[PDB]
mmCIF file of C-alpha atoms in Angstrom:
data_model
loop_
_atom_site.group_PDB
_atom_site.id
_atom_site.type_symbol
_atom_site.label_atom_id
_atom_site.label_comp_id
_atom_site.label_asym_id
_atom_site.label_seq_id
_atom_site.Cartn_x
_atom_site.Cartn_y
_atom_site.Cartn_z
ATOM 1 C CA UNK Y 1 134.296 116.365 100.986
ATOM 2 C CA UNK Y 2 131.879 119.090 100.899
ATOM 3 C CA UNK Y 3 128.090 118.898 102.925
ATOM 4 C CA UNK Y 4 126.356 118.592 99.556
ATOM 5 C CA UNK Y 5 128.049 115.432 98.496
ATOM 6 C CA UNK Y 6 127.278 114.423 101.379
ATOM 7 C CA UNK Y 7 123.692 114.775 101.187
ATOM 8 C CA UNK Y 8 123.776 113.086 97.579
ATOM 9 C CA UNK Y 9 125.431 109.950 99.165
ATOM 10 C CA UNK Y 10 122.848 109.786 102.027
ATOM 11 C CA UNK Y 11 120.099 110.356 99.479
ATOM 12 C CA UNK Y 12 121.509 107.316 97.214
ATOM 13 C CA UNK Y 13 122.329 105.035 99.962
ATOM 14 C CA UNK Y 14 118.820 105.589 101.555
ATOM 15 C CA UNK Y 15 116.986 105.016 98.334
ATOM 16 C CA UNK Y 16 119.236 101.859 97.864
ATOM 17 C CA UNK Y 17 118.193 100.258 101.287
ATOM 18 C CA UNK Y 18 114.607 100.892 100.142
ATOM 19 C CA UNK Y 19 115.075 98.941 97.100
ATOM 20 C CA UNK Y 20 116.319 96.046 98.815
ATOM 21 C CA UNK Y 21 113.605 96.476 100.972
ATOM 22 C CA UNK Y 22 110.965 96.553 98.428
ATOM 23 C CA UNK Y 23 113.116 93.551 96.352
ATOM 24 C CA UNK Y 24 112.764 91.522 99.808
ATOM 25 C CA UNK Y 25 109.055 91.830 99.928
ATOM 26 C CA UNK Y 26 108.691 91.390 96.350
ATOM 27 C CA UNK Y 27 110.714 88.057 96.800
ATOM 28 C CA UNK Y 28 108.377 87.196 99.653
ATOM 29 C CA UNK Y 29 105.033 87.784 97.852
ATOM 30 C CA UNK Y 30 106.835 85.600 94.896
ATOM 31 C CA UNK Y 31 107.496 83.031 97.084
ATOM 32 C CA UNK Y 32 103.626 83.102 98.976
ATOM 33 C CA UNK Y 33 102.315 82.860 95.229
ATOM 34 C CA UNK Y 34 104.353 79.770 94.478
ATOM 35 C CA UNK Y 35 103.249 78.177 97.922
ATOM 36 C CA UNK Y 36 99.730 79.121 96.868
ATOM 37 C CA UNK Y 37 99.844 77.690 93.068
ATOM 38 C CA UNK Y 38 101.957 74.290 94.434
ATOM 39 C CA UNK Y 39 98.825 73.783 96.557
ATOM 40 C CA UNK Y 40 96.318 74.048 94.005
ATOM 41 C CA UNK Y 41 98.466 72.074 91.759
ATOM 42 C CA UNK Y 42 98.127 68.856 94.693
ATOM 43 C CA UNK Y 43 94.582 69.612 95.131
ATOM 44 C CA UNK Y 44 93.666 69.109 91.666
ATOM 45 C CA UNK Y 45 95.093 65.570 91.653
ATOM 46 C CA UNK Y 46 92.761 64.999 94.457
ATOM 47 C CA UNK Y 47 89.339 66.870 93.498
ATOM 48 C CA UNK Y 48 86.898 65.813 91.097
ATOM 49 C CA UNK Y 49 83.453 67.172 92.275
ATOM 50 C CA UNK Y 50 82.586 69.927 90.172
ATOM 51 C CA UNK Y 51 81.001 71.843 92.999
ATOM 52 C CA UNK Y 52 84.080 72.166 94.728
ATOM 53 C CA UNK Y 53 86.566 72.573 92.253
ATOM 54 C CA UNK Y 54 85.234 75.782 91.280
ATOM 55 C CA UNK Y 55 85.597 77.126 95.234
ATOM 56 C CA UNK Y 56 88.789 76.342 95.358
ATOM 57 C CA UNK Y 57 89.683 78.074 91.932
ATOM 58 C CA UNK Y 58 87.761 81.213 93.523
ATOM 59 C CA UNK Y 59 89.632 80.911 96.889
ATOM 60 C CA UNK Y 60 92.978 80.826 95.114
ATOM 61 C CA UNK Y 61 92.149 83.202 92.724
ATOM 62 C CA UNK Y 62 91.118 85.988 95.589
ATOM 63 C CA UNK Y 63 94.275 84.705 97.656
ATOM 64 C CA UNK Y 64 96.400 85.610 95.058
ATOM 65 C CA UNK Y 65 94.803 88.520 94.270
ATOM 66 C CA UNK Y 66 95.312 89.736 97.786
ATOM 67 C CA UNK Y 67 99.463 88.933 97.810
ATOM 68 C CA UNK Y 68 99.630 90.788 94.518
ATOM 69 C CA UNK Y 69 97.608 93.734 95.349
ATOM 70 C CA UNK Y 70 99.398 93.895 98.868
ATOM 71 C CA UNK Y 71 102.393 93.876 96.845
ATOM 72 C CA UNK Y 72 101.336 96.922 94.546
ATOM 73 C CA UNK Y 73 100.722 98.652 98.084
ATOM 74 C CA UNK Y 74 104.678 98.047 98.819
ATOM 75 C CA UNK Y 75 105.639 99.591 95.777
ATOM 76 C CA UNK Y 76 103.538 102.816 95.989
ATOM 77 C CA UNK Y 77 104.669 102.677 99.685
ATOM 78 C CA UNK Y 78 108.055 102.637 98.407
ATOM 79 C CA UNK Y 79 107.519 105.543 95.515
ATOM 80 C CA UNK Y 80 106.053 107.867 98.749
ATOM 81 C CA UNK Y 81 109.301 106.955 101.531
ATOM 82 C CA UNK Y 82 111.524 107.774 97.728
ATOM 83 C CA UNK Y 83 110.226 110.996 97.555
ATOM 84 C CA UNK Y 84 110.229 112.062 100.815
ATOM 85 C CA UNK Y 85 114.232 110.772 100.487
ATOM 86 C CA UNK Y 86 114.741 112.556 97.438
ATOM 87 C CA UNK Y 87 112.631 115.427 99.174
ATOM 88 C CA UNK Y 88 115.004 115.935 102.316
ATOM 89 C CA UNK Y 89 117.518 115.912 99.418
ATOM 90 C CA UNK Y 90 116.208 118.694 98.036
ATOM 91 C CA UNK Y 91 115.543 120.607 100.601
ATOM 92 C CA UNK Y 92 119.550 121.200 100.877
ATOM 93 C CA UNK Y 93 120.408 121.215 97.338
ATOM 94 C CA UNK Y 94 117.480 122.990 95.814
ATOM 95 C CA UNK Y 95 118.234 126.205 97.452
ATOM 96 C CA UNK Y 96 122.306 126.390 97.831
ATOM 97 C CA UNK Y 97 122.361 127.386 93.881
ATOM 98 C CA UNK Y 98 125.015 124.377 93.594
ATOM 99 C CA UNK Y 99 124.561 123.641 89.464
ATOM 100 C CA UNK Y 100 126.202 120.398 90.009
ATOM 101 C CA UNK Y 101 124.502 119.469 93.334
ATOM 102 C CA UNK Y 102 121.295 120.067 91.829
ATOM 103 C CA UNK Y 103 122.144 117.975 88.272
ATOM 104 C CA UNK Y 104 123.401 114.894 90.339
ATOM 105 C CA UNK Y 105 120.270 115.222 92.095
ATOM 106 C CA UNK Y 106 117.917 114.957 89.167
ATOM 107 C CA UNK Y 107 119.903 112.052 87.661
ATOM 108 C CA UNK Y 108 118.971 110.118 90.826
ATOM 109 C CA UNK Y 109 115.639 111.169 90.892
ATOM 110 C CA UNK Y 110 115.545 109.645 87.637
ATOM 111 C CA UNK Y 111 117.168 107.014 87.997
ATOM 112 C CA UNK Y 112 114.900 105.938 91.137
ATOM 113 C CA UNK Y 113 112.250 106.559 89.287
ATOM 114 C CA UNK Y 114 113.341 103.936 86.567
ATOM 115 C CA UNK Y 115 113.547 101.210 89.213
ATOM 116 C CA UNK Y 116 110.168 101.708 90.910
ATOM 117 C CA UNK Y 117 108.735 100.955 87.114
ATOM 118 C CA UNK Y 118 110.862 98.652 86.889
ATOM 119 C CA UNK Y 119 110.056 96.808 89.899
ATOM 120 C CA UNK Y 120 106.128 97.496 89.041
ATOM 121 C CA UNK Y 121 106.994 95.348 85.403
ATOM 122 C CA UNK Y 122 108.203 92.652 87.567
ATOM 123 C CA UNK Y 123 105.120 92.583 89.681
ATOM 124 C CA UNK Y 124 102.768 92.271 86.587
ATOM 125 C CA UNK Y 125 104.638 89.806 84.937
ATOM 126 C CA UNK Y 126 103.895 87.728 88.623
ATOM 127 C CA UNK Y 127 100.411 88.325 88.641
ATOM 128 C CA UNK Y 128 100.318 87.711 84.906
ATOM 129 C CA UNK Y 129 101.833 84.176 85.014
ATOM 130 C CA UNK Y 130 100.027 83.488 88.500
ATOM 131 C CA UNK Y 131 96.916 84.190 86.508
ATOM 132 C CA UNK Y 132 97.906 82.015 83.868
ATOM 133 C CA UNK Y 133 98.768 79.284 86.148
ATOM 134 C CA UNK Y 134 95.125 79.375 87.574
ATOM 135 C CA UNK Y 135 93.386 79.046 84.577
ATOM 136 C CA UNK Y 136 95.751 76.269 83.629
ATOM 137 C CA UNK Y 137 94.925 74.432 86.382
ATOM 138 C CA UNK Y 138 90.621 75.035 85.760
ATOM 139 C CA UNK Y 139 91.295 74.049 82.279
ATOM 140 C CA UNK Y 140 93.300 70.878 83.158
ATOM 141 C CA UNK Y 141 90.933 69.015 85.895
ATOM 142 C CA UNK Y 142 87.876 69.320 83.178
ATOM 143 C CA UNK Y 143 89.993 67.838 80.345
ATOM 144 C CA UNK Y 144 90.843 63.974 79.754
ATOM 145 C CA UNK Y 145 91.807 64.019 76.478
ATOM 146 C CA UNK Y 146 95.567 63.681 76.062
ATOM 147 C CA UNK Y 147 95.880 65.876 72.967
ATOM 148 C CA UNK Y 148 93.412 68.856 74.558
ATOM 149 C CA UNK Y 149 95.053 68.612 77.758
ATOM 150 C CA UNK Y 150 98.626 69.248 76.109
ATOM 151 C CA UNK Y 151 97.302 71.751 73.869
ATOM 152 C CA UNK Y 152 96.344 73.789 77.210
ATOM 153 C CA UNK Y 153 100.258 72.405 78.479
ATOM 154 C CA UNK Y 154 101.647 73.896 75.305
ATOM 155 C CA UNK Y 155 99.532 77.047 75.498
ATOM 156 C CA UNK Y 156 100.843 77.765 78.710
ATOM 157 C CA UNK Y 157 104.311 77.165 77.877
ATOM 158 C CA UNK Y 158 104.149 79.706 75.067
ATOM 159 C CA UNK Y 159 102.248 82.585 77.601
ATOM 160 C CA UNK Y 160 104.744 82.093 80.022
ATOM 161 C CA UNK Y 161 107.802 82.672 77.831
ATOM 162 C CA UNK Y 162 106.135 85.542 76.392
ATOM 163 C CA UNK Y 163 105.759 87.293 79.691
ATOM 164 C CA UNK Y 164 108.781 86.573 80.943
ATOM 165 C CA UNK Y 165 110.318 87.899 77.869
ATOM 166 C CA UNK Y 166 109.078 91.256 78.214
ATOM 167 C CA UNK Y 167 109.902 91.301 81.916
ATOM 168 C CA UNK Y 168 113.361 90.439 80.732
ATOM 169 C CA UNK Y 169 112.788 93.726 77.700
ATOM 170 C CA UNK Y 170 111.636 96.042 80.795
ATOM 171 C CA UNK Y 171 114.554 95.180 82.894
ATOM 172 C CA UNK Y 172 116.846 95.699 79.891
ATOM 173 C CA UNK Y 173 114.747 98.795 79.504
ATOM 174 C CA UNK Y 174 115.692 100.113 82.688
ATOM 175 C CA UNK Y 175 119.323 99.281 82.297
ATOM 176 C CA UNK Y 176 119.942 101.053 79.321
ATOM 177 C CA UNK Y 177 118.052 104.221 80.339
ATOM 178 C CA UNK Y 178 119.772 104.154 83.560
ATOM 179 C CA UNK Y 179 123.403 104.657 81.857
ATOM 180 C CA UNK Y 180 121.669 107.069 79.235
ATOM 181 C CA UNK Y 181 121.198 109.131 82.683
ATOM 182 C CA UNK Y 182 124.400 108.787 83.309
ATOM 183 C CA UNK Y 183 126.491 109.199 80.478
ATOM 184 C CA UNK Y 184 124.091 112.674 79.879
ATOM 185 C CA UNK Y 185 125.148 113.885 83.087
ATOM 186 C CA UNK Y 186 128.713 112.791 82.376
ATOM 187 C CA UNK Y 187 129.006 114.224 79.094
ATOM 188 C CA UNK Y 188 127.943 117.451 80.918
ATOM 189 C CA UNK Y 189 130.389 117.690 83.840
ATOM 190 C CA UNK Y 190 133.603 116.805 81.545
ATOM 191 C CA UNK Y 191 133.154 119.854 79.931
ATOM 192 C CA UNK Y 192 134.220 122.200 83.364
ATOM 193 C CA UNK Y 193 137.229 121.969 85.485
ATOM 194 C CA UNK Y 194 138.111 122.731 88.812
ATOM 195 C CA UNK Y 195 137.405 120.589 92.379
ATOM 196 C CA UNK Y 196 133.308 120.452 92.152
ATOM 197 C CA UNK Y 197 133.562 119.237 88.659
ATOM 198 C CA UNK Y 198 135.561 116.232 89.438
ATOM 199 C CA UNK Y 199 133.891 115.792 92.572
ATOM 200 C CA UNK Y 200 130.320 115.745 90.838
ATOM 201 C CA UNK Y 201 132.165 113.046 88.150
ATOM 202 C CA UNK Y 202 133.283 110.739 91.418
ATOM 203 C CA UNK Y 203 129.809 110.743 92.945
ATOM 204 C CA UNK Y 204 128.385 109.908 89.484
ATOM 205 C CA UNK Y 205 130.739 106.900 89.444
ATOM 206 C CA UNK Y 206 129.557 105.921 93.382
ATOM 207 C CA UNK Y 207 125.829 106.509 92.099
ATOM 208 C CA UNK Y 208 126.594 104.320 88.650
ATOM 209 C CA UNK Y 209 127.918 101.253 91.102
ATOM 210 C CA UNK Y 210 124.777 101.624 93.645
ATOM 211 C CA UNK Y 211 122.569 101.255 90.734
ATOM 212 C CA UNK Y 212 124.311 98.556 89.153
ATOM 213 C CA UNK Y 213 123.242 96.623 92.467
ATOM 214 C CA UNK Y 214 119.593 98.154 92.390
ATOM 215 C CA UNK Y 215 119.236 96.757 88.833
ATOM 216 C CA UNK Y 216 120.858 93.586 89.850
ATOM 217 C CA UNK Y 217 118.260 92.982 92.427
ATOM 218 C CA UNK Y 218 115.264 92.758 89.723
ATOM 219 C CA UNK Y 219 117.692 90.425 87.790
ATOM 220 C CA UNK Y 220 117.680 87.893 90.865
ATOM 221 C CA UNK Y 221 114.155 88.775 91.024
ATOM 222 C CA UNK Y 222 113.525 87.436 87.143
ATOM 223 C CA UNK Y 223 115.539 84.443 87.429
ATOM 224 C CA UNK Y 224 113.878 83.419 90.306
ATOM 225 C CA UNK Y 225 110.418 84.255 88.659
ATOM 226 C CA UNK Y 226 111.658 81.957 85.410
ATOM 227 C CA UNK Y 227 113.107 79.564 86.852
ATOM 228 C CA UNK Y 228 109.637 79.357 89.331
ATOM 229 C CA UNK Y 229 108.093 79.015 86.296
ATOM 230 C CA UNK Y 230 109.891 76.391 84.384
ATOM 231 C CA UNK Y 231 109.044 73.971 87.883
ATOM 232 C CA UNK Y 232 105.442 74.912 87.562
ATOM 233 C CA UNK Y 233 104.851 74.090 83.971
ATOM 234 C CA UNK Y 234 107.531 71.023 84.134
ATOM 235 C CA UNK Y 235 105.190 70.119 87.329
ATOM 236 C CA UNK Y 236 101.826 70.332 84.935
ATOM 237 C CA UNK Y 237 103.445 68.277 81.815
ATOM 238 C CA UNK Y 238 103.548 65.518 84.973
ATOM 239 C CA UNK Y 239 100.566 66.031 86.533
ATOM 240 C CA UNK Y 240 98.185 65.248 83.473
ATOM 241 C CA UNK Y 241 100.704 62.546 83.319
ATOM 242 C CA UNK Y 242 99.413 60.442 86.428
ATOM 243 C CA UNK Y 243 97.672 56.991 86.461
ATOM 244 C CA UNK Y 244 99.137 56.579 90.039
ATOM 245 C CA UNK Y 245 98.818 59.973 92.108
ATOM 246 C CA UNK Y 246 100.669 59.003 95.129
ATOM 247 C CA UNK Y 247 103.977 59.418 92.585
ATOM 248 C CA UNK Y 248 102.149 62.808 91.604
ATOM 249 C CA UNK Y 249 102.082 63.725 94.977
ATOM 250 C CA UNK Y 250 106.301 63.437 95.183
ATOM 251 C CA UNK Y 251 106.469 65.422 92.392
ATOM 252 C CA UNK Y 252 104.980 68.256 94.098
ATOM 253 C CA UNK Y 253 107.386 67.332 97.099
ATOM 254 C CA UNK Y 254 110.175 67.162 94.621
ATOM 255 C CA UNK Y 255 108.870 70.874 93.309
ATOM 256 C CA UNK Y 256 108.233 71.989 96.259
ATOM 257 C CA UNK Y 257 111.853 71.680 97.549
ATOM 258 C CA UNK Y 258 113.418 73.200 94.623
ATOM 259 C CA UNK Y 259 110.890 76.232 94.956
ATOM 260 C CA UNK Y 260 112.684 76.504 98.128
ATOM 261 C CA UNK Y 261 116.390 76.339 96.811
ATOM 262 C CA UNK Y 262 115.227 78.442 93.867
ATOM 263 C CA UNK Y 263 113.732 81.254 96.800
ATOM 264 C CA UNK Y 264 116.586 80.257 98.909
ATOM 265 C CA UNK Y 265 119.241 81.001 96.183
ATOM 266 C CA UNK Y 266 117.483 84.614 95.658
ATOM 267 C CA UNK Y 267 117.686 85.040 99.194
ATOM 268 C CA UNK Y 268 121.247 84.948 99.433
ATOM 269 C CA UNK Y 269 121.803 87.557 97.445
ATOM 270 C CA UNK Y 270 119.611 90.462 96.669
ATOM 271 C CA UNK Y 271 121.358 93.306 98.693
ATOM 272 C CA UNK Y 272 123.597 90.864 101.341
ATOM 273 C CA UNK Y 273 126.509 93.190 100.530
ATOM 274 C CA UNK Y 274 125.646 96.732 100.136
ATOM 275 C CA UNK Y 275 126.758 97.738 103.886
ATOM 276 C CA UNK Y 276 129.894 97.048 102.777
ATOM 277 C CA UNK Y 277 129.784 98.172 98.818
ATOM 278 C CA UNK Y 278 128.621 101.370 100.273
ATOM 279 C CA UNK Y 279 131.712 100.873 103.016
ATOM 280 C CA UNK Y 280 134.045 101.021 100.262
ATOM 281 C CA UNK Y 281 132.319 103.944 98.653
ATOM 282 C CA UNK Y 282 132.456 106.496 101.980
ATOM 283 C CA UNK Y 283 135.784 104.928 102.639
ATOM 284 C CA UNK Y 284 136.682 106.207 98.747
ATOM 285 C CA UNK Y 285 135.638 109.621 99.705
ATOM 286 C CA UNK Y 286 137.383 109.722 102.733
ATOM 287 C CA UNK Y 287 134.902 108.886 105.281
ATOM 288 C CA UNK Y 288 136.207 108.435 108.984
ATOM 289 C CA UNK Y 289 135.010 105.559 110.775
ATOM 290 C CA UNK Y 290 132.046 107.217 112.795
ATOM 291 C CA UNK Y 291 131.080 108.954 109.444
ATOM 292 C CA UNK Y 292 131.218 105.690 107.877
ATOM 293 C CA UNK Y 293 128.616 104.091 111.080
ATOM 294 C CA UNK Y 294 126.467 106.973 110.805
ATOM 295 C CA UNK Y 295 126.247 106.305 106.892
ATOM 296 C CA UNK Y 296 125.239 102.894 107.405
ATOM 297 C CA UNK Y 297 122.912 103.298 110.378
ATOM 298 C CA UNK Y 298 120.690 106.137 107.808
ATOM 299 C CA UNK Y 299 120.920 103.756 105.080
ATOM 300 C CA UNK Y 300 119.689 101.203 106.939
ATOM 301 C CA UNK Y 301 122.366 99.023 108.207
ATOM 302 C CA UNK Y 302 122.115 96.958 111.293
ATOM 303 C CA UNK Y 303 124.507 97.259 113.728
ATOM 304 C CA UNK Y 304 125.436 93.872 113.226
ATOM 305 C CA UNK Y 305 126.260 94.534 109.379
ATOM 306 C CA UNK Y 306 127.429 98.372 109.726
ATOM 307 C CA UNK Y 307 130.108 96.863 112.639
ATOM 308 C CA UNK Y 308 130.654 94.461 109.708
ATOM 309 C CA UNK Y 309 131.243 96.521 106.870
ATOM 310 C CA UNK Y 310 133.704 99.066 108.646
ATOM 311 C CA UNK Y 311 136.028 95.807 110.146
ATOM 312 C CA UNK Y 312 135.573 94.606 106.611
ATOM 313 C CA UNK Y 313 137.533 97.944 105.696
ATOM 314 C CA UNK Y 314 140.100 97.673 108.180
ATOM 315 C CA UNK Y 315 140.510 93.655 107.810
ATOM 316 C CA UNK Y 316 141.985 94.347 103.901
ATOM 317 C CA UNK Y 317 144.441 96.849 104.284
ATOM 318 C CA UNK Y 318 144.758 98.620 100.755
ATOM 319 C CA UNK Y 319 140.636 99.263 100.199
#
């Protein structure tokens, strides 16, 4: 189709595998948290010595500290592999004096840039309800009153929906921005004719479908994070409720397989068909078959799902 569309594919696909990357290990540090505060949760039905109470508050606390600021480290790793992506990128387009090339090529800098932020809000709002969860828990095992404890219960339950709503504004955020990007760059190639200019509005409709998947994968992330979060505070309303704690104890059992299905249904899935969305895409620009491979082996494929992807092609006659 021409070697600098080419380049702007392999650029976007790249920078797509790295997202669902990043959104994997995101997931992963989400789902070590929630281990971590489902713990502390069934040692506080247990503990009463004072002493030891506060150690395990500290030991939590610096756990989770760690598997959010191991976390942070994934995301600036990620910001460093997306600019050397969007620098090999460059490195072709920057000096081939291709106007359109080059215009594509800042609308997915851009746009990658939006999702990194993006995916930094979703961390904080982690950390900030894992925080919150912490100090629900320290306020909790020192209170006996029922009307102080749900005070703290109700507290909570505000916080949380208050930083999950302005996760939710971010993502939002990064949505609408994202098809500002777009429809800019749009509004600017409908204005010229000819081969390149149609070309340049095809690869912004390829680049407008890989980001609809990139913002999709913070969406899973969200849910997952709210729906964590309505367990854990569902799981505190019962766990000042407890004259008998070996029923408190199956409550955490009960929570912790949901966390599970709640992981397990992000798992499933956050990226599971972008060998084959991608597929369609080089198959749309008229990709052979070992152009298609070598597409998905850059971008990150396996050769299990690249294999995949391509007989996925061939299997629906028509794509």
């Amino acid at each position: 189709m021409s070697e600098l569309a080419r380049k702007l594919l392999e650029a976007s696909t790249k920078l797509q595998r790295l997202n669902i990357r990043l959104a994997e290990a995101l997931l992963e540090a989400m789902a070590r948290l929630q281990e971590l505060n489902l713990e502390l949760v069934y040692l506080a039905v247990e503990l009463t010595d004072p002493k030891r109470i506060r150690d395990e508050i500290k030991e939590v606390k610096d756990k989770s500290k760690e598997i959010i600021r191991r976390a942070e480290k994934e995301i600036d790793d990620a910001a460093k592999e997306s600019e050397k992506i969007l620098e090999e990128a460059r490195e072709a387009i920057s000096g081939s004096g291709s106007y359109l090339a080059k215009l594509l090529l800042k609308a997915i800098a851009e746009t990658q840039d939006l999702n990194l932020r993006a995916a930094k809000a979703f961390l904080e709002a982690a950390a900030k309800l894992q925080e919150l969860n912490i100090r629900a828990v320290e306020l909790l095992v020192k209170l006996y009153d029922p009307a102080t404890i749900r005070e703290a219960l109700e507290h909570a339950k505000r916080r949380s929906k208050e930083i999950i709503d302005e996760a939710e504004r971010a993502i939002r955020a990064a949505k609408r921005e994202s098809e500002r990007i777009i429809e800019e760059a749009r509004r600017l190639i409908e204005k010229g004719s000819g081969s390149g200019s149609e070309l340049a509005r095809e690869l912004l409709r390829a680049h407008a479908q890989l980001q609809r998947l990139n913002l999709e994968l913070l969406r899973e992330l969200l849910r997952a994070l709210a729906q964590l979060q309505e367990l854990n505070l569902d799981l505190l309303r019962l766990a000042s409720e407890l004259t008998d704690p070996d029923e408190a104890r199956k409550a955490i059992a009960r929570s912790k397989r949901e966390s599970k299905r709640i992981v397990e249904d992000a798992e499933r899935g956050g990226g599971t068909f972008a060998c084959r969305i991608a597929a369609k895409i080089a198959a749309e620009f008229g990709y052979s078959e070992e152009q298609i491979k070598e597409l998905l082996k850059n971008a990150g494929c396996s050769e299990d799902e690249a294999r995949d992807a391509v007989e996925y092609l061939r299997s629906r006659p028509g794509l």
